[PDB]
Design a protein around this ligand. Structure first.
Ligand SMILES: [Cl-]
Ligand SMILES: [Mg+2]
Length: 502
Protein backbone atom coordinates (compact mmCIF):
# COMPACT_ATOMS: atom_id res chain seq x y z
CA UNK A 1 0.00 0.00 0.00
CA UNK A 2 3.04 2.23 0.56
CA UNK A 3 5.28 2.85 -2.45
CA UNK A 4 8.74 1.54 -1.59
CA UNK A 5 10.96 4.52 -2.36
CA UNK A 6 12.50 7.73 -1.07
CA UNK A 7 10.27 10.30 0.65
CA UNK A 8 10.71 14.05 1.24
CA UNK A 9 10.23 15.85 4.57
CA UNK A 10 9.31 19.49 4.09
CA UNK A 11 7.42 22.44 5.41
CA UNK A 12 4.85 23.63 2.90
CA UNK A 13 6.17 27.20 3.25
CA UNK A 14 9.94 26.77 3.67
CA UNK A 15 10.67 24.87 0.42
CA UNK A 16 9.52 26.82 -2.58
CA UNK A 17 7.98 30.26 -2.50
CA UNK A 18 5.66 29.68 0.45
CA UNK A 19 2.54 27.56 -0.18
CA UNK A 20 1.39 24.09 -1.17
CA UNK A 21 0.95 24.93 -4.86
CA UNK A 22 4.51 26.25 -4.96
CA UNK A 23 5.78 23.00 -3.43
CA UNK A 24 3.67 21.01 -5.89
CA UNK A 25 5.27 22.93 -8.77
CA UNK A 26 8.73 22.10 -7.42
CA UNK A 27 7.90 18.39 -7.24
CA UNK A 28 6.68 18.69 -10.86
CA UNK A 29 9.78 20.46 -12.17
CA UNK A 30 13.21 20.77 -10.55
CA UNK A 31 12.53 17.97 -8.03
CA UNK A 32 10.54 15.76 -10.42
CA UNK A 33 11.18 12.04 -10.38
CA UNK A 34 12.78 11.91 -6.92
CA UNK A 35 10.09 11.18 -4.34
CA UNK A 36 7.41 8.52 -4.12
CA UNK A 37 6.12 10.23 -0.98
CA UNK A 38 6.11 13.54 0.86
CA UNK A 39 5.73 14.18 4.58
CA UNK A 40 4.12 17.63 4.75
CA UNK A 41 4.73 19.05 8.20
CA UNK A 42 1.72 20.53 10.07
CA UNK A 43 -0.12 22.81 7.67
CA UNK A 44 -3.20 23.55 9.80
CA UNK A 45 -4.34 26.92 11.09
CA UNK A 46 -1.91 28.36 12.00
CA UNK A 47 1.39 26.90 10.79
CA UNK A 48 3.59 29.68 12.24
CA UNK A 49 2.67 29.66 15.93
CA UNK A 50 5.01 29.16 18.87
CA UNK A 51 5.62 25.47 18.04
CA UNK A 52 5.95 25.84 14.24
CA UNK A 53 2.74 24.11 13.21
CA UNK A 54 2.40 21.64 16.10
CA UNK A 55 0.14 23.96 18.13
CA UNK A 56 -2.70 24.65 15.67
CA UNK A 57 -5.82 26.51 16.72
CA UNK A 58 -7.99 24.53 14.26
CA UNK A 59 -6.51 21.15 13.36
CA UNK A 60 -9.44 20.51 10.97
CA UNK A 61 -8.57 23.23 8.44
CA UNK A 62 -5.53 24.01 6.30
CA UNK A 63 -3.98 27.41 6.95
CA UNK A 64 -5.45 29.52 4.15
CA UNK A 65 -2.07 31.17 3.59
CA UNK A 66 -0.89 27.70 2.54
CA UNK A 67 -3.98 26.61 0.55
CA UNK A 68 -6.89 24.27 1.26
CA UNK A 69 -7.55 20.53 1.32
CA UNK A 70 -7.82 20.41 -2.49
CA UNK A 71 -4.18 21.48 -2.74
CA UNK A 72 -3.27 18.51 -0.54
CA UNK A 73 -5.59 16.29 -2.58
CA UNK A 74 -3.94 17.37 -5.85
CA UNK A 75 -0.40 16.77 -4.61
CA UNK A 76 -1.35 13.35 -3.26
CA UNK A 77 -2.86 12.16 -6.54
CA UNK A 78 0.46 10.59 -7.55
CA UNK A 79 2.65 10.50 -4.41
CA UNK A 80 2.06 9.08 -0.97
CA UNK A 81 1.45 11.84 1.57
CA UNK A 82 2.32 11.75 5.27
CA UNK A 83 0.51 14.22 7.53
CA UNK A 84 0.49 14.83 11.28
CA UNK A 85 -2.35 14.01 13.68
CA UNK A 86 -2.03 15.62 17.12
CA UNK A 87 -4.05 13.09 19.11
CA UNK A 88 -3.52 14.17 22.73
CA UNK A 89 -4.73 17.76 23.02
CA UNK A 90 -6.49 20.72 21.41
CA UNK A 91 -5.94 24.46 21.45
CA UNK A 92 -7.47 26.60 24.17
CA UNK A 93 -8.41 29.00 21.35
CA UNK A 94 -10.29 26.30 19.44
CA UNK A 95 -14.03 26.76 19.02
CA UNK A 96 -14.82 23.69 21.12
CA UNK A 97 -12.85 24.96 24.12
CA UNK A 98 -14.03 28.57 23.90
CA UNK A 99 -17.56 27.17 23.96
CA UNK A 100 -16.66 25.37 27.19
CA UNK A 101 -15.40 28.63 28.67
CA UNK A 102 -18.66 30.32 27.64
CA UNK A 103 -21.22 27.69 28.65
CA UNK A 104 -19.39 25.54 31.21
CA UNK A 105 -20.99 22.18 31.94
CA UNK A 106 -23.89 23.28 29.71
CA UNK A 107 -21.57 23.08 26.70
CA UNK A 108 -22.10 20.43 24.05
CA UNK A 109 -18.31 19.98 24.08
CA UNK A 110 -17.93 19.51 27.85
CA UNK A 111 -17.01 15.77 27.82
CA UNK A 112 -14.43 16.40 25.06
CA UNK A 113 -11.77 17.73 27.44
CA UNK A 114 -9.90 16.00 30.24
CA UNK A 115 -10.23 17.47 33.73
CA UNK A 116 -8.85 16.56 37.14
CA UNK A 117 -12.10 14.92 38.25
CA UNK A 118 -12.09 12.73 35.12
CA UNK A 119 -8.96 10.93 36.37
CA UNK A 120 -8.84 11.31 40.18
CA UNK A 121 -12.13 10.55 41.91
CA UNK A 122 -11.04 10.64 45.56
CA UNK A 123 -10.70 13.55 47.95
CA UNK A 124 -7.43 12.80 49.78
CA UNK A 125 -5.50 15.68 48.20
CA UNK A 126 -2.26 14.25 49.58
CA UNK A 127 -2.98 10.94 47.85
CA UNK A 128 -3.98 12.62 44.58
CA UNK A 129 -0.74 14.61 44.67
CA UNK A 130 1.33 11.46 45.26
CA UNK A 131 -0.25 9.99 42.13
CA UNK A 132 0.18 13.24 40.19
CA UNK A 133 3.89 12.93 40.97
CA UNK A 134 3.98 9.56 39.18
CA UNK A 135 2.61 11.07 35.95
CA UNK A 136 5.38 11.49 33.40
CA UNK A 137 5.70 15.07 32.11
CA UNK A 138 8.30 16.33 29.61
CA UNK A 139 8.66 19.87 31.00
CA UNK A 140 7.96 21.55 34.38
CA UNK A 141 4.89 23.21 32.83
CA UNK A 142 1.61 23.47 34.81
CA UNK A 143 -0.01 20.14 35.56
CA UNK A 144 -3.53 21.59 35.53
CA UNK A 145 -4.72 24.91 34.16
CA UNK A 146 -7.63 26.37 36.16
CA UNK A 147 -10.02 28.07 33.74
CA UNK A 148 -13.18 29.89 34.73
CA UNK A 149 -16.00 28.24 32.77
CA UNK A 150 -19.60 29.25 32.21
CA UNK A 151 -18.65 32.91 31.82
CA UNK A 152 -21.75 33.48 29.64
CA UNK A 153 -24.18 31.80 32.07
CA UNK A 154 -25.50 32.73 35.52
CA UNK A 155 -23.19 30.13 37.08
CA UNK A 156 -19.40 30.08 36.97
CA UNK A 157 -16.92 27.43 38.04
CA UNK A 158 -13.13 27.06 38.06
CA UNK A 159 -12.13 23.71 36.56
CA UNK A 160 -8.61 22.20 36.54
CA UNK A 161 -8.05 21.00 32.98
CA UNK A 162 -5.30 18.50 32.22
CA UNK A 163 -2.56 20.27 30.20
CA UNK A 164 0.44 18.09 29.38
CA UNK A 165 2.32 20.62 27.24
CA UNK A 166 1.25 24.25 27.73
CA UNK A 167 -1.69 25.92 29.40
CA UNK A 168 -2.88 26.73 25.84
CA UNK A 169 -3.14 23.04 24.90
CA UNK A 170 -6.05 21.27 26.62
CA UNK A 171 -5.74 17.49 26.80
CA UNK A 172 -8.80 15.84 25.29
CA UNK A 173 -10.57 12.72 26.54
CA UNK A 174 -9.82 10.38 23.63
CA UNK A 175 -12.02 7.78 25.36
CA UNK A 176 -15.14 9.93 25.13
CA UNK A 177 -17.46 9.75 22.13
CA UNK A 178 -16.67 13.38 21.27
CA UNK A 179 -12.94 12.64 21.36
CA UNK A 180 -13.33 9.79 18.89
CA UNK A 181 -15.55 12.00 16.71
CA UNK A 182 -12.98 14.81 16.75
CA UNK A 183 -10.13 12.48 15.79
CA UNK A 184 -12.29 10.70 13.20
CA UNK A 185 -13.26 14.00 11.57
CA UNK A 186 -9.61 14.83 10.88
CA UNK A 187 -8.98 11.31 9.56
CA UNK A 188 -12.03 11.91 7.35
CA UNK A 189 -10.44 14.97 5.72
CA UNK A 190 -7.22 12.91 5.37
CA UNK A 191 -8.68 10.01 3.39
CA UNK A 192 -10.73 12.40 1.24
CA UNK A 193 -7.50 14.32 0.48
CA UNK A 194 -5.28 11.43 -0.70
CA UNK A 195 -3.34 11.25 2.57
CA UNK A 196 -1.80 7.79 3.00
CA UNK A 197 0.28 7.95 6.18
CA UNK A 198 -0.64 9.38 9.57
CA UNK A 199 2.15 10.46 11.90
CA UNK A 200 0.58 10.27 15.37
CA UNK A 201 1.90 12.98 17.69
CA UNK A 202 1.90 12.79 21.51
CA UNK A 203 -0.06 9.53 21.37
CA UNK A 204 2.02 8.17 24.27
CA UNK A 205 0.23 10.59 26.61
CA UNK A 206 -3.31 10.13 25.34
CA UNK A 207 -4.57 7.69 28.01
CA UNK A 208 -4.67 8.64 31.69
CA UNK A 209 -4.95 6.14 34.56
CA UNK A 210 -4.69 7.22 38.19
CA UNK A 211 -1.71 5.55 39.85
CA UNK A 212 0.29 5.03 36.64
CA UNK A 213 2.70 7.25 34.74
CA UNK A 214 0.06 7.80 32.00
CA UNK A 215 2.67 7.05 29.31
CA UNK A 216 2.48 4.13 26.87
CA UNK A 217 0.24 2.10 29.13
CA UNK A 218 -1.31 -1.12 27.88
CA UNK A 219 -4.45 1.01 27.58
CA UNK A 220 -2.45 3.44 25.46
CA UNK A 221 -1.54 0.64 23.04
CA UNK A 222 -5.20 -0.39 22.91
CA UNK A 223 -6.13 3.19 21.99
CA UNK A 224 -3.35 3.37 19.38
CA UNK A 225 -4.52 0.11 17.81
CA UNK A 226 -8.17 1.22 17.76
CA UNK A 227 -7.10 4.48 16.11
CA UNK A 228 -4.82 2.63 13.68
CA UNK A 229 -7.50 0.05 12.88
CA UNK A 230 -9.90 2.83 11.87
CA UNK A 231 -7.15 4.45 9.79
CA UNK A 232 -6.54 1.14 8.00
CA UNK A 233 -10.22 0.76 7.04
CA UNK A 234 -10.00 4.30 5.63
CA UNK A 235 -7.09 3.15 3.47
CA UNK A 236 -4.33 4.73 5.55
CA UNK A 237 -1.54 3.69 7.89
CA UNK A 238 -0.19 5.06 11.15
CA UNK A 239 3.30 5.97 12.33
CA UNK A 240 3.83 6.11 16.10
CA UNK A 241 6.39 8.88 16.63
CA UNK A 242 8.45 8.89 19.83
CA UNK A 243 11.97 9.74 21.00
CA UNK A 244 12.88 7.07 23.53
CA UNK A 245 15.30 4.36 24.51
CA UNK A 246 15.84 2.03 21.58
CA UNK A 247 14.09 -0.94 23.20
CA UNK A 248 10.91 1.15 23.46
CA UNK A 249 11.01 1.70 19.68
CA UNK A 250 11.35 -2.07 19.20
CA UNK A 251 8.47 -2.78 21.58
CA UNK A 252 6.20 -0.22 19.93
CA UNK A 253 7.04 -1.44 16.43
CA UNK A 254 6.10 -5.03 17.33
CA UNK A 255 2.51 -3.90 18.06
CA UNK A 256 2.01 -0.85 15.80
CA UNK A 257 2.13 -0.23 12.07
CA UNK A 258 5.31 1.86 11.94
CA UNK A 259 7.99 3.67 13.94
CA UNK A 260 10.89 5.97 13.14
CA UNK A 261 14.45 4.70 13.08
CA UNK A 262 15.98 7.37 15.29
CA UNK A 263 19.09 5.26 15.92
CA UNK A 264 20.63 5.73 12.46
CA UNK A 265 21.29 9.52 12.66
CA UNK A 266 23.69 9.34 15.65
CA UNK A 267 24.98 5.85 14.79
CA UNK A 268 25.90 6.77 11.19
CA UNK A 269 27.69 9.91 12.40
CA UNK A 270 29.52 7.86 15.03
CA UNK A 271 30.36 5.20 12.43
CA UNK A 272 31.82 7.83 10.10
CA UNK A 273 33.62 9.70 12.90
CA UNK A 274 35.34 6.56 14.25
CA UNK A 275 35.45 4.27 11.16
CA UNK A 276 33.92 1.56 13.37
CA UNK A 277 30.56 0.13 12.31
CA UNK A 278 30.17 -2.36 15.20
CA UNK A 279 27.30 -0.53 16.89
CA UNK A 280 25.68 0.23 13.53
CA UNK A 281 25.84 -3.43 12.48
CA UNK A 282 24.44 -4.51 15.85
CA UNK A 283 21.45 -2.17 15.47
CA UNK A 284 20.65 -3.33 11.93
CA UNK A 285 20.61 -6.93 13.20
CA UNK A 286 17.75 -6.08 15.59
CA UNK A 287 16.17 -2.91 14.22
CA UNK A 288 12.44 -2.77 13.42
CA UNK A 289 11.80 -3.33 9.73
CA UNK A 290 8.45 -1.48 9.78
CA UNK A 291 10.12 1.90 10.12
CA UNK A 292 10.86 5.17 8.37
CA UNK A 293 14.55 5.99 8.28
CA UNK A 294 16.08 9.47 8.51
CA UNK A 295 19.40 11.15 8.85
CA UNK A 296 18.07 14.65 9.50
CA UNK A 297 14.57 15.67 10.52
CA UNK A 298 12.90 19.04 11.05
CA UNK A 299 14.14 18.75 14.65
CA UNK A 300 17.67 18.43 15.99
CA UNK A 301 19.82 15.31 15.91
CA UNK A 302 18.50 13.01 18.63
CA UNK A 303 21.23 11.78 20.99
CA UNK A 304 19.28 10.13 23.83
CA UNK A 305 17.75 7.88 21.16
CA UNK A 306 20.93 5.75 21.35
CA UNK A 307 21.82 6.47 25.00
CA UNK A 308 21.18 4.61 28.22
CA UNK A 309 17.86 4.90 30.05
CA UNK A 310 17.71 4.06 33.74
CA UNK A 311 19.27 0.62 34.10
CA UNK A 312 18.95 -0.05 30.34
CA UNK A 313 22.09 0.42 28.22
CA UNK A 314 22.47 2.46 25.06
CA UNK A 315 23.62 1.37 21.63
CA UNK A 316 27.01 3.04 22.16
CA UNK A 317 28.84 3.66 25.41
CA UNK A 318 28.57 6.91 27.36
CA UNK A 319 32.13 7.76 26.27
CA UNK A 320 31.22 7.33 22.60
CA UNK A 321 28.15 9.55 23.01
CA UNK A 322 30.13 12.37 24.61
CA UNK A 323 32.78 12.14 21.89
CA UNK A 324 30.05 12.10 19.23
CA UNK A 325 28.47 15.29 20.59
CA UNK A 326 31.88 16.95 20.89
CA UNK A 327 32.87 16.02 17.33
CA UNK A 328 29.65 17.58 15.99
CA UNK A 329 30.58 20.86 17.67
CA UNK A 330 34.08 20.65 16.19
CA UNK A 331 32.86 19.86 12.68
CA UNK A 332 30.38 22.76 12.72
CA UNK A 333 33.09 25.09 14.10
CA UNK A 334 30.97 25.67 17.20
CA UNK A 335 27.79 26.62 15.32
CA UNK A 336 25.88 23.71 16.85
CA UNK A 337 26.97 24.94 20.31
CA UNK A 338 25.26 28.28 19.61
CA UNK A 339 21.99 26.53 18.65
CA UNK A 340 22.04 23.77 21.32
CA UNK A 341 21.02 24.27 24.94
CA UNK A 342 23.46 23.78 27.79
CA UNK A 343 23.81 20.42 29.53
CA UNK A 344 25.94 19.09 32.38
CA UNK A 345 27.08 16.08 30.33
CA UNK A 346 26.61 15.43 26.62
CA UNK A 347 25.37 11.94 27.56
CA UNK A 348 22.24 13.74 28.88
CA UNK A 349 21.74 15.91 25.77
CA UNK A 350 18.30 15.52 24.21
CA UNK A 351 19.18 16.83 20.74
CA UNK A 352 22.01 18.62 18.94
CA UNK A 353 20.71 21.41 16.72
CA UNK A 354 22.83 21.22 13.56
CA UNK A 355 22.43 20.19 9.92
CA UNK A 356 23.57 16.67 9.17
CA UNK A 357 25.81 18.07 6.43
CA UNK A 358 27.56 20.38 8.92
CA UNK A 359 27.75 17.56 11.45
CA UNK A 360 29.91 15.79 8.86
CA UNK A 361 32.00 18.95 8.37
CA UNK A 362 30.42 19.46 4.93
CA UNK A 363 32.44 16.47 3.68
CA UNK A 364 30.67 15.58 0.43
CA UNK A 365 32.03 12.02 0.24
CA UNK A 366 31.15 11.09 3.83
CA UNK A 367 27.71 12.65 3.39
CA UNK A 368 26.96 10.59 0.28
CA UNK A 369 28.21 7.52 2.16
CA UNK A 370 25.88 8.43 5.03
CA UNK A 371 22.81 8.63 2.78
CA UNK A 372 23.75 5.40 0.99
CA UNK A 373 23.88 3.67 4.38
CA UNK A 374 20.44 5.15 5.12
CA UNK A 375 18.91 4.01 1.83
CA UNK A 376 20.35 0.48 2.21
CA UNK A 377 19.00 0.04 5.76
CA UNK A 378 15.51 -1.49 6.08
CA UNK A 379 12.44 0.72 6.08
CA UNK A 380 11.21 3.62 3.97
CA UNK A 381 13.95 6.28 3.63
CA UNK A 382 13.00 9.93 4.22
CA UNK A 383 15.20 12.83 3.09
CA UNK A 384 14.83 16.17 4.86
CA UNK A 385 14.38 19.03 2.40
CA UNK A 386 17.37 20.90 3.84
CA UNK A 387 19.62 17.85 3.58
CA UNK A 388 18.38 17.13 0.05
CA UNK A 389 20.11 20.35 -1.02
CA UNK A 390 23.13 20.21 1.33
CA UNK A 391 22.01 23.36 3.08
CA UNK A 392 24.50 24.80 5.54
CA UNK A 393 23.62 25.86 9.08
CA UNK A 394 21.34 28.89 8.83
CA UNK A 395 23.05 31.18 11.32
CA UNK A 396 21.21 34.23 9.97
CA UNK A 397 17.78 32.77 10.70
CA UNK A 398 19.04 31.55 14.08
CA UNK A 399 20.16 35.07 15.02
CA UNK A 400 16.85 36.48 13.79
CA UNK A 401 14.41 34.12 15.54
CA UNK A 402 16.58 32.87 18.45
CA UNK A 403 14.91 29.45 17.99
CA UNK A 404 17.55 26.73 18.22
CA UNK A 405 15.96 24.44 15.64
CA UNK A 406 15.85 27.19 12.99
CA UNK A 407 19.54 26.52 12.29
CA UNK A 408 18.07 23.52 10.42
CA UNK A 409 14.84 25.11 9.06
CA UNK A 410 16.01 27.38 6.23
CA UNK A 411 13.70 29.16 3.80
CA UNK A 412 14.80 27.64 0.49
CA UNK A 413 13.09 29.46 -2.37
CA UNK A 414 12.44 28.00 -5.80
CA UNK A 415 15.46 30.02 -6.95
CA UNK A 416 17.71 28.51 -4.27
CA UNK A 417 16.54 25.00 -5.21
CA UNK A 418 17.47 25.63 -8.86
CA UNK A 419 20.98 26.65 -7.77
CA UNK A 420 21.47 23.90 -5.19
CA UNK A 421 20.53 21.02 -7.52
CA UNK A 422 23.59 22.03 -9.54
CA UNK A 423 25.96 21.19 -6.69
CA UNK A 424 27.90 17.96 -7.36
CA UNK A 425 27.02 16.46 -3.96
CA UNK A 426 23.32 17.12 -4.65
CA UNK A 427 23.57 15.61 -8.13
CA UNK A 428 25.24 12.59 -6.54
CA UNK A 429 22.47 12.34 -3.96
CA UNK A 430 19.79 12.45 -6.66
CA UNK A 431 21.48 9.56 -8.48
CA UNK A 432 21.47 7.58 -5.23
CA UNK A 433 17.77 8.41 -4.80
CA UNK A 434 17.09 7.08 -8.31
CA UNK A 435 18.95 3.84 -7.62
CA UNK A 436 16.96 3.45 -4.39
CA UNK A 437 13.69 4.13 -6.25
CA UNK A 438 14.15 1.82 -9.23
CA UNK A 439 15.90 -1.35 -7.98
CA UNK A 440 13.40 -3.96 -6.78
CA UNK A 441 15.88 -5.61 -4.37
CA UNK A 442 14.72 -3.37 -1.51
CA UNK A 443 11.34 -5.11 -1.73
CA UNK A 444 13.04 -8.36 -0.63
CA UNK A 445 15.41 -9.93 1.90
CA UNK A 446 18.08 -8.06 3.85
CA UNK A 447 21.47 -9.02 5.26
CA UNK A 448 24.12 -7.05 7.17
CA UNK A 449 27.78 -8.10 7.47
CA UNK A 450 30.72 -6.43 9.23
CA UNK A 451 34.09 -8.18 8.96
CA UNK A 452 37.62 -6.80 8.63
CA UNK A 453 36.69 -3.10 8.56
CA UNK A 454 34.19 -3.80 5.75
CA UNK A 455 30.46 -3.21 6.22
CA UNK A 456 28.14 -4.88 3.71
CA UNK A 457 24.38 -4.19 3.45
CA UNK A 458 22.73 -6.57 0.97
CA UNK A 459 19.29 -6.83 -0.62
CA UNK A 460 17.82 -9.36 -3.04
CA UNK A 461 14.32 -9.62 -4.51
CA UNK A 462 13.07 -11.49 -7.59
CA UNK A 463 16.19 -11.49 -9.78
CA UNK A 464 17.27 -8.03 -8.62
CA UNK A 465 20.01 -7.44 -6.06
CA UNK A 466 21.71 -4.44 -4.48
CA UNK A 467 24.62 -4.27 -2.05
CA UNK A 468 26.51 -1.46 -0.31
CA UNK A 469 30.11 -2.25 0.67
CA UNK A 470 31.90 0.31 2.86
CA UNK A 471 35.61 -0.41 3.37
CA UNK A 472 36.71 1.77 6.28
CA UNK A 473 40.41 0.91 5.95
CA UNK A 474 40.48 2.04 2.30
CA UNK A 475 37.74 4.65 2.80
CA UNK A 476 35.88 3.28 -0.22
CA UNK A 477 32.12 2.93 -0.64
CA UNK A 478 30.75 0.81 -3.49
CA UNK A 479 27.26 -0.17 -4.65
CA UNK A 480 26.82 -3.38 -6.64
CA UNK A 481 23.51 -4.05 -8.39
CA UNK A 482 21.84 -6.65 -10.58
CA UNK A 483 18.80 -5.43 -12.56
CA UNK A 484 17.43 -5.33 -16.11
CA UNK A 485 19.88 -8.10 -16.99
CA UNK A 486 22.75 -5.72 -16.10
CA UNK A 487 25.43 -5.94 -13.44
CA UNK A 488 26.53 -2.49 -12.31
CA UNK A 489 29.19 -1.13 -9.97
CA UNK A 490 28.98 2.40 -8.59
CA UNK A 491 31.87 3.77 -6.54
CA UNK A 492 30.69 6.66 -4.37
CA UNK A 493 34.00 8.45 -4.87
CA UNK A 494 33.74 7.97 -8.63
CA UNK A 495 30.12 9.16 -8.41
CA UNK A 496 31.18 12.40 -6.73
CA UNK A 497 34.11 12.92 -9.11
CA UNK A 498 31.94 12.42 -12.19
CA UNK A 499 29.62 15.25 -11.12
CA UNK A 500 32.55 17.59 -10.44
CA UNK A 501 33.84 17.21 -14.02
CA UNK A 502 30.53 16.72 -15.87
CL1 LIG B 1 6.83 0.74 6.97
MG1 LIG C 1 -1.67 9.88 -2.03
Amino acid sequence: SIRNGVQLITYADRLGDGNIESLTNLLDGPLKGLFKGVHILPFYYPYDGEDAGFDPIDHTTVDERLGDWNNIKKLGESVDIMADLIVNHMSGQSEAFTDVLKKGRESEYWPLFLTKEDVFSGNDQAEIDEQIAKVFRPRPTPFFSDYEVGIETDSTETVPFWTTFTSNQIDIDVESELGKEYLSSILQSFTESNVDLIRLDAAGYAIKRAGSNCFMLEETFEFIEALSKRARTMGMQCLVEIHSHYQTQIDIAARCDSVYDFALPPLVLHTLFTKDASALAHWLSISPRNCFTVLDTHDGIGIVDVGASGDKPGLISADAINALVEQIHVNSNGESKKATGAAANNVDLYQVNCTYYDALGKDDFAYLVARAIQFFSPGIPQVYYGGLLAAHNDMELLANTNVGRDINRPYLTTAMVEDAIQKPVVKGLMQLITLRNENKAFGGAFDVTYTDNTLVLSWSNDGDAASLTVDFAAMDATINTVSNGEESTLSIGALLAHHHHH
